[PDB]
Structures are given as C-alpha cells and as structure tokens.
Structure 1
Amino acid sequence: WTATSGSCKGRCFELQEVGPPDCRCDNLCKSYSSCCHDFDELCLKTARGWECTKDRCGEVRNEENACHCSEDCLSRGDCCTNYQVVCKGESHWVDDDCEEIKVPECPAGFVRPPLIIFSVDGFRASYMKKGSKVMPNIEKLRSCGTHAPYMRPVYPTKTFPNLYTLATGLYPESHGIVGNSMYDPVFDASFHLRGREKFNHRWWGGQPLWITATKQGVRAGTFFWSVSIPHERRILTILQWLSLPDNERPSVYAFYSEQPDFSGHKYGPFGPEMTNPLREIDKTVGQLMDGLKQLRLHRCVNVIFVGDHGMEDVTCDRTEFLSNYLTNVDDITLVPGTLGRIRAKSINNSKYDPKTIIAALTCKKPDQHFKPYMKQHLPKRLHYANNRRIEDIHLLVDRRWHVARKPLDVYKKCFFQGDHGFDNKVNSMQTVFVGYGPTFKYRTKVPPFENIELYNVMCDLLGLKPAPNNGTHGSLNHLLRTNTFRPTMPDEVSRPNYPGIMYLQSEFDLGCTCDDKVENKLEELNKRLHTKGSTKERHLLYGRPAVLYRTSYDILYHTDFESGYSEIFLMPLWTSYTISKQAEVSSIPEHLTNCVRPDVRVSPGFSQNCLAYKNDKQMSYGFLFPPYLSSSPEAKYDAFLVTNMVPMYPAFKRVWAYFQRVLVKKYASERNGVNVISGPIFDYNYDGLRDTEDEIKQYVEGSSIPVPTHYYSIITSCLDFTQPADKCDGPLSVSSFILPHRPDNDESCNSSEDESKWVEELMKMHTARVRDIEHLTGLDFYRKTSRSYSEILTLKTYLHTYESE
C-alpha cells in the first residue's frame, strides 16, 4: 500500500528513497506504483517541449514549462539545453573544435571531476563506422577522446547481465543476474523483466558502483530510469542534480537509452529504419554536452559512452525446435531464444534424465544450429557455470538462430528481425566504448577489451577502492591520462626445489619399460649442463611462473624444455619450451612407442606409474613436452620421462597429438617461433578456480594420479614477427586455450574425420585469456620481461577470438 496523498513539491527526483507508505518522488517511484499523486504534474512537465526558440529568450519564468529560457534559468540550473545557443549566441558543443583537456577545468567547489555513464542498449560496435554520418556528437566524443574499436560484452549477451557486469566488474555467474529470465531453486522464485519483483535485493550480488561510491563518501545519482520518463527529462534531471550545492551534489551519474535495441529487434541491426534511432541518440548526447557546456562542465566531467551488447539478424524462420529431437518434450522446461537452458518440468519426475536429453540433442541433424552442453563443459572463457540459477543443461545457439521447445511457442507468444544473447565472441554481439574527459587520453585508440574491466576504471575515475571483482586492475591503465593504478606483482608463495640425481633406476617399480639401454666425455659434459639449466634461457623466455599457493614442487631442466613438477599432483603444473621457425618435426621411433623412463631426480613415491594406466581401461597418457619436437634423437629420450607424462583419454589424445605434431610447428612457422607453456587444470567444481587436492573427483584407477578436467597452452611470440620469439625486443603476442579433457569427442560433430577437419575448430572454440589460466592454476606468468607491468596485465587479459574483421 502507498499513501499517494503526500506531495512531490520541491522533491522531484529526490536522491534518497523515503520510507513506505509515505509517497515517493524518486525515479523508481513509477516502477513501484508509489509516486505521489502530483508526480506527473510537478516532475514530468512537458509544456512547450525541450528547446528554446528565439521568442522565448528572456521570457518571464513560467513554472509549467518543461524547461526554461528565462534569464534566471542558469542559476536555477533548469534551462533547456540549447538555451545559450538560441538566446546567448553560443555554439553547440559539437561545432567546437576538439581541444585537448590536459587538466580538469571545473567550477569552484568541485572536489573531483564527475563521471557520467551514457549507456545505450543494443548499440553494435560497427554502428560507430556505419552510422558515423548521422551521429556527429558521438563521432566527436569518439575521435577526440579515447575509444576502442569494440568492447566485448559478457555471456549471455543480454541487457541485464551486461549492465550489471558494468556496475560490478563481476561475471554474471558471480553477480547472479545470469539471464533476463531466471529461476532460483533455493528461493523457489522466478526473475522477470516485468514489474517490481526483480527489485528484490536477493537477486543482486556483488557491490555495484553506486554502493561502492556511497560507502566511501562519494554521492551517486540514481542509475535506473523508469521506461516512461522521456530521454530529454533524464538529461534535464542529471543537469539539475549537477547544480546542487557541493554537499548535496552527486559525483557519479548514469543515463540509459533503450534504443537502438528496441528498433533493432523490430528491424534488424541494419534495417533502413535504424538511421532515425541513431540520429535520436546522437541528439540526446548533443543535449547533454550542450547542457554541460552551459554549466561550464564540458572540460570537467568524464563521459563514458558505452553499450551493453550488439544485435544480430534473427528471424522466426531460423528456429530449431526441441520437439524435433526429444520424444519427452513435455517433461522439460526450456528458457528459449538465443541460448537454451533446460531443466525438469517437475522435480517429482524421477524418470527425467539429463544424460538421455543431451544424447538426443547431440549431432542429430546435418546442419544443426545449436549444440548442447552440460554447463561445466561450456568453454571456460564464458565463465558461465558456477551459479545455481544456471541450469545444468545449456544450448549454445548459432548466431542468426533461435531455439524453442515447440513450433506453437513461436507463433502463439513474424514479428522480430533482430536479437542478441549469443556467445560473447560473436562479431555482431560486440558493443562500444568511448571515454572523453580530463582523466581519459586525448585522440587515443586502445585495443578491444572486456566490459568486466570497466568497474575498476570507473572506481579509479572516482578515487574509489573497488570491491573484489573479475577485472584485472591496471589492465586498462593505458586508457587514462592520470589516476592510473599501479599494482605490484603478486608474491610467490612456494619456492621450487631443484633436485639433482638422487635415485638409482632399480629403486623404481613403476611397471614402465623403455628400450633406452643404448650407450663419451665430449657429450657427457653436455647432458650434465642441460640437466643443470644450460638451455633454460631459450625455453623459459619470461621467467618461471610464480606458484601463488602453498605446495611442494620441483624445477626440472632438460635440453628442450623446463618444467615445474608437482610432488602433490604427480605431474607438471607447467612445462615451458620454445620452437623456432626452423624447428623440425620428427616421429616417435618404433622402438620407443611405449617407452616411459623413471626420472632419477624424483622419488618413486612422487612419480606416476605405468601399471595404473595399464589397469585403467578408460585412461591412457600423453606428454606435455611433445616427443615430435625433440631437438635430436638423444634429447628425445627426455620427452619420455615419467615426469613429463599426464593422464589422457584416448579420445583426447587425438586432439592433443594433432596439436603437438601439426599445430605447434604451424604456429612457429607463422609467428616466427613460439614459446609454449602447457599444463593440466583441475576444476571439478567448475568455479573457474584451481582445485585443492580434496576437490578431485577422478583418479587413474588404483592410483593417486589425479585426472585433469582441462589442458591449457599459452603460446607467446614477438608482436613484431620480424623478430624471432626467442630474440624479441618489444611487445609480445599471445594466444591461449583451455581444452576440455573429455572421454569422447561428442562436442565435435565431424570427429570421425581426420583431425585436420575438426581439431583446430575445437581449439578455437576453447580459446582463453592467460588470466583465465592463472585463475585455474594459481600460477602467475610473464614475471620477467622487459615490458611494463600494466602492459603485461593487458597482454594477460587478451583473448584471441578468431572472428574475421
């Protein structure tokens, strides 16, 4: 109940919420059905529109007008935004030459440059180029400030998950807004875009920017605008707040536009109907900048022009129906559209089985336009699993398509020509970022980056300490003229042991055999030098990785590779090697096919054994440093050390062998040498974070050899490919992957074919940032380079996406 009989007189868009059932005048009041009786009359005036005209100049103040052109309006802070242009002979901001803002030029009483976040829904990255002729205000912000060619949203590429990621710096799995629609089984409650229930505090995790600000003594404007407050009124409200007395005035503000998304759904991303919404958004930016110019704030405020996601061509005819796959279609609940989430219709139905649902959805039709996954098997780069609101069964839907339960769902719900929500690496889902103001750089282009990084920067812009989040703070320092955040490298927690030869061959009873008893002082000194690290500079190019947790591990040196060998997990945490452009690929000699050799530096007790693999009828093994790339017949024996062996399903060995035999040399040819670091990952609870040993769910049968859930590789070379990887003077170039360690290749519909037709495609799908691997392993890479730490942080957040231009 609201007692709507109070009044909004002098309270319009008040900043604190009043306690029920006293009537409200804040911007959420409409959403709650709780505004005072006179809120429309007082707070949503429209009389005479939004622009001054020559005849209104110097008018007698009429309180009924939407905005004012009377002489007193500047000090009231409520002129129409074009007031100074129409009445005082001033230019529009867009018509002024771009002039570098080296320092904040702020009115007296401003303690910091305010931040205004101008957020646009459905604003696809390519609109910046393709709509440039009709967006002069946005184009000026872009060319004069700092801009990226695009900004990567989070998955799913929907509005609420992305805007709340902007607010918090968190993946949706951590902040809890995992879709525009959700069921939480603990709450037994459902989240819907319609109504006030979505406002319930239990949906919203993390700490959004307006709460971070408030907790630290920085005042915030309210970020949510009810759909029926027109854009011109949103801008006027922000401008009015900016005229409050110092002690009352916020320092951070947000504007939101539901365009171009709304029209993009109806017309498609490039429908001829899209020109007008683009022009209208630009006019709104123009109103804001003119308004700031009037308030002498246009060289004081930092403006962020940012989108939530793009927009793809999607029509009713491109819908896959689960009723064409599943016999049991009525025992499932589907969250449909550009992604699929499936769960049981009734928890009382004990005949429901995810395994048979997945199999019925796997590679069933030749050009099938979705792929089913258990959520833990989704590409780790999506970070889309660790939340009870994310259903165990997920459908990744191809761009341009939908999935629905039954045909009747599509015509009893063609309307739409555009949609979004797909994989966040898809070109059409990319969105925009521009920063303009004293704290941003002047006329500067920066590489694409992920929207999870922005919260930290917004906190920097406001002098706030960010709450713990998924950005990598310092990775966007290159966007900023000042206020950069200068992190220190994390401290190494565990120091390695450097074992020498400590065991005789006969102390090992591992059930391994090798045909290696084939027998020189010249070359004997060499083998010793190699085991002491003489080639380490070639193979460990950026320092050894730091181990950031407590554990027991050994550094092992070899001619062709170096490794950090875990005595706890019985295998390397990492294996580092360099392959030059000139390197030759060789085969595994016939006599060495099943060769595994005890490592006399490492105790039998801390070694794997061959017998476990023989007895485990499902599990085989592979090698982290590939025998195919040995530098010489003699160095090849090192590759068969038991300390280089890792457990691998035969199905996965197909993938791994093709990567190691073919693709590594391909990359070294293409990139002018590569340095490779490879290793295992254990993430049995799918939280994106390294497992402790007590979290491991599967071992090689009859042993304490843990089975990895994933294998990673980090492949580094010189950004200037005229220099070889091992003699690189400047910036680095990286690509990485985190491949799922699966007992079948059901994910790859073409897997019965030669590896050349499917393996690299699988690897591309599982592309990763170095930072993702850091989370998953508790390792810290690139500790010793000649590069600045912030540059390395940027490198660690890089994702090679494989999309075209």
Structure 2
Amino acid sequence: WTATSGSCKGRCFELQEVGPPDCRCDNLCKSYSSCCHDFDELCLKTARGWECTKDRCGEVRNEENACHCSEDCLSRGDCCTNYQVVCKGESHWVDDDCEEIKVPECPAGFVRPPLIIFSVDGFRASYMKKGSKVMPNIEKLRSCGTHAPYMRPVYPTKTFPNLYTLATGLYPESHGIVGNSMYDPVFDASFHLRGREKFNHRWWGGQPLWITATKQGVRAGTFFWSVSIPHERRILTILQWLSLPDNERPSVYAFYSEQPDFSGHKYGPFGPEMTNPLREIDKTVGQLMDGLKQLRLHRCVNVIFVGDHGMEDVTCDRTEFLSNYLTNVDDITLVPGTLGRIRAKSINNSKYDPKTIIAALTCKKPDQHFKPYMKQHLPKRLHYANNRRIEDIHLLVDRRWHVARKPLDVYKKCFFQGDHGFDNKVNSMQTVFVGYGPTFKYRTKVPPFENIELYNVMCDLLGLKPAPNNGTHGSLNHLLRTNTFRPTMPDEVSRPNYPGIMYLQSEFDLGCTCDDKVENKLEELNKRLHTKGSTKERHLLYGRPAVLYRTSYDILYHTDFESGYSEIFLMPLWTSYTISKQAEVSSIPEHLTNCVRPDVRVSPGFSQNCLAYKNDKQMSYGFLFPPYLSSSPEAKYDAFLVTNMVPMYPAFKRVWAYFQRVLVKKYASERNGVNVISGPIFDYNYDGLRDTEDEIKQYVEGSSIPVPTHYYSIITSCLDFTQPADKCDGPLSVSSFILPHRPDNDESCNSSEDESKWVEELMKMHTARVRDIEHLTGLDFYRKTSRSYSEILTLKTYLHTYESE
C-alpha cells in the first residue's frame, strides 16, 4: 500500500527517499508504483521541449516549461542547457579549445571537485574510433582527458554484474549479482531485469560507492534511474542538484544511458541504425557539459565516461540446442543465451547426475560452439565460482553464438542481431573509459585495465577510504594528476630458513633411486658456491617472493634455479629460474628417467617419497625446474632432487612436459630470455584464495603429500626486448597462467593429437594476472626491482589476452 494522496510540491527529485505509506517524489518512485498523484505534473514537465530558442530569450518565467530561458534561470539553477549559448552569445563547450585543468576551478563553497559518472550501456570499445565522426563531445573528453584504448569488463559481460562491479570494485561472485538473471537456491527466488524481486536488498552485497560516500559524510546522488525518466530530465536534475546549498548538495552523481545497448541488440553492433543512438548519446554529453559550463563547473567537476560491456553479432540461427545433446532435457533448467548455467529441474530428484550431463555435452560435435565446465574448473581469471547463485554446471559459449535448451525456447519467447555476456577477454565485449577533469591527467593515454579497479579511483577522487574490494589500489595511480594513493608493499610474515648440508644419504628411506654415483678441486668449490647462492642474481631477478602468512619454509639454491621449499606442504611454494635466448634444450638421459634424489639439506620427515607415487596408481610426479633446461649434465642432477618434485596426473604431465621442453625455450627465443617462477596452487573451496592445510581434500595415496588444484607460472622479460631478461634497465613485460591440474584432458577436444596442436591453446585459455596468483598463493612478487611500486602494481594487474589487435 501507498496513500499516494500527498504532494511533490517543493520535493521534485528529493534526495532522501521517504518510507511508505507516504508518497515519494524521488527518481525511483515510478518503478515502485509509489509516486505522489502530482509527480508527473510537477516533476516531469515537458512543455516547450529542452532547448532555448532566440524568441524565448529573457521571457517571463512560466513554471510549466521543461526548462527556462528567463533572466532569473541561472539563479534558480534551471535554465535549458543551451541558454547561455542561444541567449548570451556563449560557445558550446565542444567548440572551445581544450585547455589543461591544472587545478580545480570551483565556485565558492565547493569543498572538493564533484564526481559525475556517465555510464553507457553496451558501448563497445571500438565505437570510439568507428563512431568518432558523430560523437564530437565524447571525442573531446577522450582526447583532452585521460583515456584507455579499452576497458575490460567482468564475466559475465552482462549489464547488472558490470554496473554493480563498477560501483563496488568486487567480482560478481563476491557482490552477488552474478548474472542479469539468477536463481538463489536458498531464497528459492529468481532475480530478473523485470519485476519487483530485484528491489530486495538481499541480492546486493558489498558496499557500493554511494554507501561508502554516505558513511564518510560525503553526500551522493541516486545511481539507479526509473526508465521512463527521459535523458534530458536526468541531466537537468543533476544540474539542479548541483545548485543546491553547500550543506545539501551531493558530491557524487550518476547518469545512466540504456543506449547504445538497446539498439545494438536489435541491429547488431555496427548496424546502420547504430549511428543515431551514438549521435544521441553525444548530444546528451553536450547538454551536460554546456550545463556545467553555465554553472562555471566545467573546470571543477571530474567526469567519468564509462561503459559496462560491448556488443557482438549474434543471430537466432547461431543457436546450439541442448536437446541435440541430451535425452533427459526435461530434467534440467538452463539459464540460456551467451553463457549457459544448468541445474536440476527438481532438488527432490536424487537421480540427477552432473557428471553424466557434463559428459553428454563434452566434445560431442566437431564444430561445437560451447564448452561445458564444472564451475571450479572454469579459468581462474574469470573469478566465477564462489557463490551459491552460480550453478555447478557452466557453459562457456563461443562469441557470436547462443545456447538454448530446446528449439521451442527460441521461437516461443528473428528478433535480435546483437548480444553480449561472453568471456570478458573477447574483443567485442571490451568497453570504454574516459576520465576528464582537474584530478585526471591531461591528454594522456593509459593502458587497458579492468573495471574492478575503478572503485578505488572513484574513492580517491572523493577523498574516501574504499571498502575492502578486488581492485589493487595504486595500480591506476597513473590515471591521476593528484590524489594518487600511496601504496606500500605488504610486510613479509614468514622469514625463510637457509639450510646447509644436515643429513647423510642413509638417513632417508624414501624408496627413491637414482643412477648418480660417478665421481676435482676446481669444480668442488664451484658446486659449493652454487649451493650457497652464487648464481642467485641470475635466477632470482626481482627478489625472493615474500610469504604473507605464517609457515615454515626453506630457501634452496642451485646452479640453475632457486626455490622456496615448504616444510608444511612438502614441496616448493615457488621455483625461480632464468632461461637466456641462447640456452639449449637437452633430454632427460636414459639412465636418469626414474631418478629422484634425497636432498641432504632437508629432513627425511619434511620430504616427499617415491613409494607413495608407486602405490598411487592415479598419481605420478613432475618437476618444477625442468631437467630439459639444465645448464650442464652435472647441474641436471639438481633437477631430480626430491625437493623439486610435485604430484602430477599423467594427463597433466602431457601439458607440463610440453610447456617445459618446448614452450619455455620458445618464449626465451621470442622475448630475449625469460625469467620463470612456477609453483603449485591449492584452491579446493574455489574461493580464489590460498587454502590452509586443513582445506586440502586430496593427498597422494597414503601420504601427507597434498595434491595441487592448479600449477602456475609467471614469465617475465624486458619490455625493451633488445635487452636480455637478465640485464633489463627499464619496464618489464609479463605473461602468466594458472593451469588446472586435471586427471584428464576432456577440456581440450583435440588432446588425442600431438601436444603442439592443443597445449598452447589450453595455456592461453588459462592466462592469468600476477595478482590472481598472489591471492591463490599468499606470495608477493617483484619485491626488488628498479621500478616504482605503482608501476609494479600495474604490471601485477596486466592480463595477456591473446586476442587479435
């Protein structure tokens, strides 16, 4: 119930929402069927449209008009945005030359530059170039301010998950808005763009910017807008709020446009019908900037022009149907379209089998345009698992395609030519970022970055302390003239031990054998020096990683590699080695095929054992430093130390061996040397964070040797590839991966072929940021470089995507 019989007189677009059954006059009242009887009349004026004309100049104020051209309109804050242009001979903002904004130039009473966030739905990155001729206001913001060539959305590349990620700095698995529609099995309820369910605050986790601002005494405009409020009225409303008294005026404002997404769905991303919506959004930017310039705020406000995701060509005829794969298609519920999520139609059904559903969907047709995954097996870079609203079964759909349950679902809803929701690495899903104002840099291009980073920046722009989030604060300092944020390295929690030779061979009963008893004063001092860390500056180029949790570990030095060996997990946490452009690949000699050697620096009780591997018929082992890349036949013996061994499924060893034998050397050749840091990851509860020992669900049979869920590598070289990795004077270049440690290669449909036909494709799919590895390991990398910490934070957030240009 609402008693809608009160009035909006003097309350139009009030900032504080009043509680039922009192009637409302705020920008959301329409959506709730709760506005006062006179809201349309008083608050949604439309008479005479949105522009001043010559004949309206200096008119007698008529309070019925949409906006005003009367002399008193500047005082009242309610002129048409072009008033000064038409009636006072001023120029439109877009026609002014651009001039550096070195300091904020704000009216008296402004305590800080306001932030206006102008969000555009479906605004694909390449619109900036391709629509440049029809978007002069946007193109001015872009060339004069700070811009990226594109901004990476979060997965799924849908509207609500991305807008709410922009507001919170959180992955959708953390904020809870995991799709445009979602079912919560605990609420037994579904969230959709339509209807009232989305209104309940129970769906919306984290702390969005408006709440962060309010808690810290910074006032915030409403970020949600009722769809029927036209754009011109949203702009006028922002400009009116900006004219409020100092104690009442918000410092942060949001404008949202449903375009170009709305037309993009109908016409495709580059349909000829798309020119007009781009012109119309540009005109709305023009209105805002002219409006700001009238209020003398155009060199005071920081403006962010940001999109939520792009748009791809997608038609009804490119739909894969599940009824073409499954027989029990009526026992499932599918969230369809540009991603798939499958769950049981009934929870009272104990004969529903996720395993058999997955198998019936795997590599079934040679051209198949989707891939099924258990959610925990999805690429870690998607961060799309740790929420009860994400179904166990996930389908990653190829760009340009849809998935649906049955044909009747498509014709009983061709409508559409565009859609979005695909993997956030896809070029067509990339969106835009422009920042313009006194706190942003002038005429500056920044590298592409992820939208999860922007919350920290918007907090910096507002003098706010951000709530805990998934951004890496400091990684976008290079966007800002001032207000940076001064990041500092996390303190190391565990310091390493440096063990010497402490154990005789015969103290070990590891059930290991090696053919290594072949017997010089020149080269015995030499080997001693190597074990003490003589070559460490060659193989550890950026300092040892810091361990950020409490544990017991040893640094072990070798001629060819250095490692941080965990006495708790019985294996290295990290192994670091450099491979120069000139390095040679060798074989594992025949006599050394099954060689594993006790490490006399490490106790029998903190070592793995070969017997466990012999007894575990599913589990084999591999090595973190590859024996193929030994510097000499003598150094090769170090590669077979028990302290370099890790548990590996035979299926995974195919992947790993190819990476180590072929790919590392290829990268060293291409990049002029590489430094590699490799190691295990344990994430059995799929939360993206390092497992404690008591979370491990799988051990090597009859041992305390834990089985990794993933293996990582971070591959660093010089950005200036004329300099070798080990003698690099300037910025660095990195690519990294987090490979799932799986007992089959069901994910790679061509895995029956030679590794040269599928391994690198798998690794590319599982590309990662250094920061993703840091969360999963509790390690902190690049502790000792000649580069600024802000720069290193940018480096740690980089993702190598392997998309074309």
Shorter-chain-normalised TM-score: which range?
over 0.9
Asked if the contact 1:680–1:710 (Cα under 8 Å) also holds between the matched residues in 2, the reply is yes
How far is the alpha carbon of 1:64 from its aligned partner? 0.3
How far is the alpha carbon of 1:487 from its aligned partner? 1.3
Asked if the contact 1:125–1:310 (Cα under 8 Å) also holds between the matched residues in 2, the reply is yes
Residue 450 of structure 1: aligned partner: 450
Asked if the contact 2:8–2:24 (Cα under 8 Å) also holds between the matched residues in 1, the reply is yes
Residue 195 of structure 1: aligned partner: 195
How far is the alpha carbon of 1:116 from its aligned partner? 0.1
SS in 1 for 2:694: helix
How far is the alpha carbon of 1:171 from its aligned partner? 0.1
Moved more, 184-193 or 16-25: 184-193
- The 1-side partners of 2:662 and 2:486 are apart by 41
How far is the alpha carbon of 1:196 from its aligned partner? 2.6
Asked if the contact 2:16–2:26 (Cα under 8 Å) also holds between the matched residues in 1, the reply is yes
Asked if the contact 1:560–1:635 (Cα under 8 Å) also holds between the matched residues in 2, the reply is yes
Gaps of 5+ in 2: none
- The 2-side partners of 1:758 and 1:194 are apart by 43
- The 2-side partners of 1:303 and 1:488 are apart by 28
Asked if the contact 2:190–2:197 (Cα under 8 Å) also holds between the matched residues in 1, the reply is no
Residue 242 of structure 1: aligned partner: 242
**Which residues of 2 match residues 94-493 of structure 1 at below 5 A?**
94-493=94-493
How far is the alpha carbon of 1:580 from its aligned partner? 0.1
Per-residue CA deviation, residues 326-378 of structure 1 (Å, 9 max, x unaligned), is 01000000000000000000001111000000000000000000000000000
How far is the alpha carbon of 1:189 from its aligned partner? 1.6
Asked if the contact 1:31–1:195 (Cα under 8 Å) also holds between the matched residues in 2, the reply is no
How far is the alpha carbon of 1:197 from its aligned partner? 2.1
Asked if the contact 1:338–1:402 (Cα under 8 Å) also holds between the matched residues in 2, the reply is yes
Per-residue CA deviation, residues 646-704 of structure 1 (Å, 9 max, x unaligned), is 00000000000000000000000000000000000000000000000000000000100
How far is the alpha carbon of 1:186 from its aligned partner? 1.3
Moved more, 181-190 or 576-585: 181-190
**Which residues of 2 match residues 465-544 of structure 1 at below 5 A?**
465-544=465-544
Per-residue CA deviation, residues 467-512 of structure 1 (Å, 9 max, x unaligned), is 0000000000000000000111000000000000000000000000
Per-residue CA deviation, residues 702-728 of structure 1 (Å, 9 max, x unaligned), is 100000000000000000000000000
SS in 1 for 2:675: strand
- The 2-side partners of 1:787 and 1:487 are apart by 14
Per-residue CA deviation, residues 7-58 of structure 1 (Å, 9 max, x unaligned), is 0001000000111100000011011000000000000000000000000000
Q: How many residues align?
A: 805
Per-residue CA deviation, residues 533-582 of structure 1 (Å, 9 max, x unaligned), is 00000000000000000000000000000000000000000000000000
How far is the alpha carbon of 1:185 from its aligned partner? 1.1
Per-residue CA deviation, residues 717-743 of structure 1 (Å, 9 max, x unaligned), is 000000000000000000000000000
- The 1-side partners of 2:364 and 2:471 are apart by 39
SS in 2 for 1:334: strand
- The 2-side partners of 1:192 and 1:581 are apart by 54
Asked if the contact 2:626–2:639 (Cα under 8 Å) also holds between the matched residues in 1, the reply is yes
Asked if the contact 2:494–2:550 (Cα under 8 Å) also holds between the matched residues in 1, the reply is yes
- The 1-side partners of 2:553 and 2:185 are apart by 42
- The 1-side partners of 2:739 and 2:200 are apart by 38
Per-residue CA deviation, residues 431-478 of structure 1 (Å, 9 max, x unaligned), is 000000000000000000000000000000000000000000000000
SS in 2 for 1:663: helix
Asked if the contact 1:770–1:796 (Cα under 8 Å) also holds between the matched residues in 2, the reply is yes
SS in 1 for 2:30: coil
Moved more, 445-454 or 197-206: 197-206
How far is the alpha carbon of 1:290 from its aligned partner? 0.1
Residue 648 of structure 1: aligned partner: 648
- The 2-side partners of 1:359 and 1:385 are apart by 20
Per-residue CA deviation, residues 573-631 of structure 1 (Å, 9 max, x unaligned), is 00000000000000000000000000000000000000000000000000000000000
How far is the alpha carbon of 1:382 from its aligned partner? 0.1
How far is the alpha carbon of 1:414 from its aligned partner? 0.4
Residue 611 of structure 2: aligned partner: 611
Moved more, 98-107 or 179-188: 179-188
- The 1-side partners of 2:132 and 2:413 are apart by 36
Asked if the contact 1:554–1:567 (Cα under 8 Å) also holds between the matched residues in 2, the reply is yes
Moved more, 184-193 or 10-19: 184-193
- The 1-side partners of 2:804 and 2:182 are apart by 33
SS in 2 for 1:30: helix
- The 2-side partners of 1:773 and 1:14 are apart by 46
How far is the alpha carbon of 1:192 from its aligned partner? 1.3
How far is the alpha carbon of 1:195 from its aligned partner? 2.2
- The 1-side partners of 2:352 and 2:790 are apart by 50
- The 2-side partners of 1:657 and 1:353 are apart by 34
Asked if the contact 2:440–2:479 (Cα under 8 Å) also holds between the matched residues in 1, the reply is yes
- The 2-side partners of 1:319 and 1:500 are apart by 63
- The 1-side partners of 2:336 and 2:80 are apart by 44
SS in 2 for 1:633: coil
Per-residue CA deviation, residues 74-104 of structure 1 (Å, 9 max, x unaligned), is 0100000000000000000000000000000
- The 2-side partners of 1:564 and 1:413 are apart by 57
SS in 1 for 2:41: helix
- The 1-side partners of 2:37 and 2:363 are apart by 59
Per-residue CA deviation, residues 291-332 of structure 1 (Å, 9 max, x unaligned), is 000000000000000000000000000000000000100000
Asked if the contact 2:142–2:434 (Cα under 8 Å) also holds between the matched residues in 1, the reply is yes
- The 2-side partners of 1:719 and 1:349 are apart by 56
SS in 1 for 2:483: coil
- The 2-side partners of 1:320 and 1:540 are apart by 49
How far is the alpha carbon of 1:118 from its aligned partner? 0.3
SS in 1 for 2:457: helix
- The 1-side partners of 2:407 and 2:282 are apart by 40
SS in 2 for 1:435: strand
Gaps of 5+ in 1: none
- The 2-side partners of 1:58 and 1:196 are apart by 45
- The 2-side partners of 1:575 and 1:594 are apart by 21
- The 1-side partners of 2:471 and 2:352 are apart by 39
- The 2-side partners of 1:589 and 1:493 are apart by 41
SS in 2 for 1:564: strand
Per-residue CA deviation, residues 255-308 of structure 1 (Å, 9 max, x unaligned), is 000000000000000000000000000000000000000000000000000000
SS in 2 for 1:190: strand
- The 1-side partners of 2:631 and 2:31 are apart by 69
SS in 2 for 1:423: coil
How far is the alpha carbon of 1:187 from its aligned partner? 1.4
Residue 80 of structure 1: aligned partner: 80
When normalised by structure 2's length, the TM-score is 1.00
SS in 1 for 2:572: strand
Runs of at least 4 residues of structure 1 off by over 3 A? none
- The 2-side partners of 1:600 and 1:350 are apart by 53
- The 1-side partners of 2:11 and 2:609 are apart by 76
- The 1-side partners of 2:72 and 2:732 are apart by 58
How far is the alpha carbon of 1:190 from its aligned partner? 1.2
- The 2-side partners of 1:359 and 1:44 are apart by 56
- The 1-side partners of 2:201 and 2:445 are apart by 39
SS in 1 for 2:509: coil
- The 1-side partners of 2:74 and 2:197 are apart by 40
SS in 2 for 1:565: strand
SS in 2 for 1:109: coil
